[PDB]
Design a protein around this nucleic acid. Structure first.
Lengths: 101, 127
RNA sequence: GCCCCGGUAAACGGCGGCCGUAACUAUAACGGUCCUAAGGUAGCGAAAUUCCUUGUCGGGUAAGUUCCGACCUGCACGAAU
RNA sequence: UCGGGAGAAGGCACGCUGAUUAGCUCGCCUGAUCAGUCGAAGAUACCAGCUGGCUGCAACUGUUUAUUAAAAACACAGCAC
RNA sequence: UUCGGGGCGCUUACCACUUUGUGAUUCAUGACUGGGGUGAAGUCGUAACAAGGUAACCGUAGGGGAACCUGCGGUUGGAUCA
RNA sequence: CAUAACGUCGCAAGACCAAAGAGGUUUUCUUGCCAUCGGAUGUGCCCAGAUGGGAUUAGCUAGUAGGUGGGGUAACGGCUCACCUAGGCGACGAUCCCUAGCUGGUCUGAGAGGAUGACCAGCCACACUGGAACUGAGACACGGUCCAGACUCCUACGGGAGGCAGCAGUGGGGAAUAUUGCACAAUGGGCGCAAGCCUGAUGCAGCCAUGCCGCGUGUAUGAAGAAGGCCUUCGGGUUGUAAAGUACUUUCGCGGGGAGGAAGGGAGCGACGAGCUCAUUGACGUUACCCGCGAAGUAGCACCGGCUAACUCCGUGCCAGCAGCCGCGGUAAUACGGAGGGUGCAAGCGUUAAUCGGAAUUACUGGGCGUAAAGCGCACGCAGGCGGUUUGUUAAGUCAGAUGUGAAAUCCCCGGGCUCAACCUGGGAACUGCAUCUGAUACUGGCAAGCUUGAGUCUCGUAGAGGGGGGUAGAAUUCCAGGUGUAGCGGUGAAAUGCGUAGAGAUCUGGAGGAAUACCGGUGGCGAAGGCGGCCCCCUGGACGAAGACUGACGCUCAGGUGCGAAAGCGUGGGGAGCAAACAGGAUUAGAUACCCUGGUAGUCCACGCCGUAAACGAUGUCGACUUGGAGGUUGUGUCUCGUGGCUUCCGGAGCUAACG
């Protein structure tokens, strides 16, 4: 986070998929982000589905993904272009999802 | 030597370990002053000035079954680093059982003797 | 003296074909299998010694068949030739 | 190879006139000081290096086609047989 | 102006910032290049462990994906009932 | 231009130099002026100590250090100038580079200490960017001035006006932080004799759960026990007195009342003086608070595998996903999703980021180094650190008494005030360090005197492969010469290559050369280490014992420095029997660019020059004192079947070590 900041905005460079390590197997969704800090790191995209393109531009929280070595940050859904998970009836605090009527 | 007081103390510590009747140590007013509290406290039978030409201090050690009269004795104030305690700083060795000899302006005295007089000084050693 | 034998290279030199492996493909790299013994180990390349060639990638420049660096199967590099 | 490279580079001054100081035995010898003053320009004529960097070749001085080539060509101490 | 002189003005020495030459340092970018870390089942051989099925270590030298191998010399903190 | 209270300047005990009224209840006061001394307060300057990180920042400096004179200023000073001298500074770190306003305090911690310095208070430095000076008690001065630069706006372009890092606000930035509000009456400030004027200083309200504290969403009653959901051995159990329902109170809201926070100017008495008396006037608010009336009247969020307190069913199925760490999921999952239930907390609840100890993991209090990380390879030696016994002076360190300082606030204790508390008030207690005065002086230090049991020396003896130079034997290998000779020799796991009847191998004799030193040798000895071993001579170091004769503590260690320091390979010259990297071939093998066999270069050997390293290992530096002995050996002495001194081994008391030792 550089300036020891809780969060840090940035613009996605590419939204590709990655495969877990030896014990796990899947297509985890990640994305290279060029934070304002001046660093280009990879962040994980929580949720069952997202809408992050090339010029996504999202805020970074910070969290390592055990399965994906290198991914030390998590994207904050519900902020900027990163739309909150759809139909999230559960932990809406995370994934940034407004409580349905 | 470098620290005569420590020497004397050691010469008695090693002497008691071998259970020797008496032990010699180069005389010195300060030494005698120390030996004085040792005899009064009951750590030694007493002492006497000896030596044909060189003044010595024949220390007559005493022992008892089970434990030795002088279980422990070590110098805490050394030439490398001197230590001074205030009236309230005087530490109680083994909650009274054991005592400590301090050197104050009033003269060489034990923790209780110094505590009573109301003065502190250089903590010579603990016994 | 020669035939014959042997020492000497501060005389002429030589260093292929195949298979497996591997790579997204082709090559080089390593071992072997065969032919004729070996098949280039220690060192060195598109070099004033490479034709094809302004070879390919790239720096540099608005643009350089020039230059520099690398790769390099170097038409016919190499140890007092 | 500390000998050098180096008058590297770069910058300033450098006229005349008056009155003086210092070095010396002295010079019609030399080095300076203060003040005044003229021109666009004072080493006002005359003599007199352009400089820095990269690359190739041969080490260097030297030698060589007297009448077209001095060159990376020859020679060289050293090394070796 | 009581002429004694003063003020205006003029000229001159000194002066941020800038320019030129050189030197030191930091930063962004960068050909080409070196090795490294990490990633269930690619590959060549097989070095070590393992007294285990050819002893180890060491200085130095060369090589090799590597631990390490090999060469020369040394040590044993060298094996074994003969 | 006058007077001199005085003050200034020379010498010594002389001469020079000053200053505006006005108003009135006007012969009396009021305001003000000039000169001097003092008071009050605020400052300029100087000095001791203290004040972050890096030496991959070490030699630096010419006004640079000092002197004389001068200039300059309110004043000291190279501050500046002329002349003279040549110094000044540095490993107690200058110079250079980097960073950050500093402090009282704040947070944390048992303390020490660490981190921080945002609110409030003190100081310092900055207002378009940069520089400068003037005027003044003071600003080198935001709404003063001058010059340079960019930008914005105005413009008949000729030329002008500005600078929100002032308040509010706009746009841009960011995860994110507010009313372009009300008001001066109160408190305080500037000016004025006063009246009075100015005062977004401040006092308040607004916005935001950002925090803290207080309060409400109800109280009592109510089934062996509804319905519904859930579980079931379907017998029943659970959610539950929980809801419904009954009674009661009744936050909001409505009506009425309505605050503290504030006297003079003026007028009357008195001389419109002192003093006394009397009268007029308020933001937040019509809010707080009081009284009356009066309806039950929002709750959510996180979590339930373990640490962590709180469980089942269903769905999904190493798929989807979870995850701080250990992990979980491939058809029975309390750790995935939902539901019922449960725990925690409550308008709050979670999440993310940041700070603290535990760490005795830099250990001063609190640590270690033979093998787990860790003694520098050795010696010499500078600075520095430390230093034996007795006496005297000083008394700097150290210790003691008194006194000054140590701002407020804060912290701690007690009491008090707002209904409690937060908050606030009063009092009380502790305080290192530093200055001053006085005193003690045992210990350290300094000065002076003195002493041998340390160390060194002398004399007489002793053992040793200690070191350097030169000179000296025998065995064996190879080659050469002579003699004599057979058919094989050689080599291997087995063989082959190879050599052989112009003759080697094997054998005898003679000669030459290089290198090494077969028993003794040892489990031994010497050297500082590496290393070093036939004998003789010369040169030279260390060391031990006796006699106690001489000097007399002159010591210990030691950053830097200096010197020494195996092997390897390297440079030049020489040499080269043997051996032997690279390498030439023959074998082995799946392959062998190894091991085995045949050749073979550098090198190995000598002279000179080079480096500085190593399991340079007892992987445990030197000196002194203290702590059972037994046994073997080297050397001196002694009353010598043993005592004693030094040296070299082994076994072992106590003790030490994680174990080995």
């Amino acid at each position: 986070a550089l300036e020891a900041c809780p969060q840090k905005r940035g613009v996605c460079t590419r939204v590709y998929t990655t495969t877990p390590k030896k014990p796990n197997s899947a297509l985890r969704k990640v994305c290279r982000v060029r934070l304002t800090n001046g660093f280009e790191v990879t962040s994980y995209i929580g949720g069952e589905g997202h809408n992050l393109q090339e010029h996504s531009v999202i805020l970074i929280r910070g969290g390592r993904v055990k399965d994906l070595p290198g991914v030390r940050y998590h994207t904050v859904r519900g902020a900027l272009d990163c739309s909150g998970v759809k139909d999230r009836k559960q932990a809406r605090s995370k994934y940034g999802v407004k409580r349905p009527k | 030597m470098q620290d005569p007081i420590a020497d004397m103390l050691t010469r008695i510590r090693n002497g008691q370990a071998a259970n020797k009747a008496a032990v010699t140590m180069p005389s010195s007013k300060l030494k005698v002053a120390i030996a004085n509290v040792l005899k009064e406290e009951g750590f030694i039978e007493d002492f006497k000035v000896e030596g044909d030409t060189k003044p010595e201090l024949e220390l007559t050690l005493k022992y008892f079954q089970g434990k030795a009269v002088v279980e422990s004795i070590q110098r805490v104030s050394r030439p490398g680093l001197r230590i001074y305690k205030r009236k309230d700083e005087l530490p109680k060795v083994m909650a009274g059982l054991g005592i400590a000899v301090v050197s104050t302006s009033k003269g060489v005295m034990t923790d209780r003797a110094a505590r009573q007089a109301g003065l502190g000084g250089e903590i010579i050693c603990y016994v």
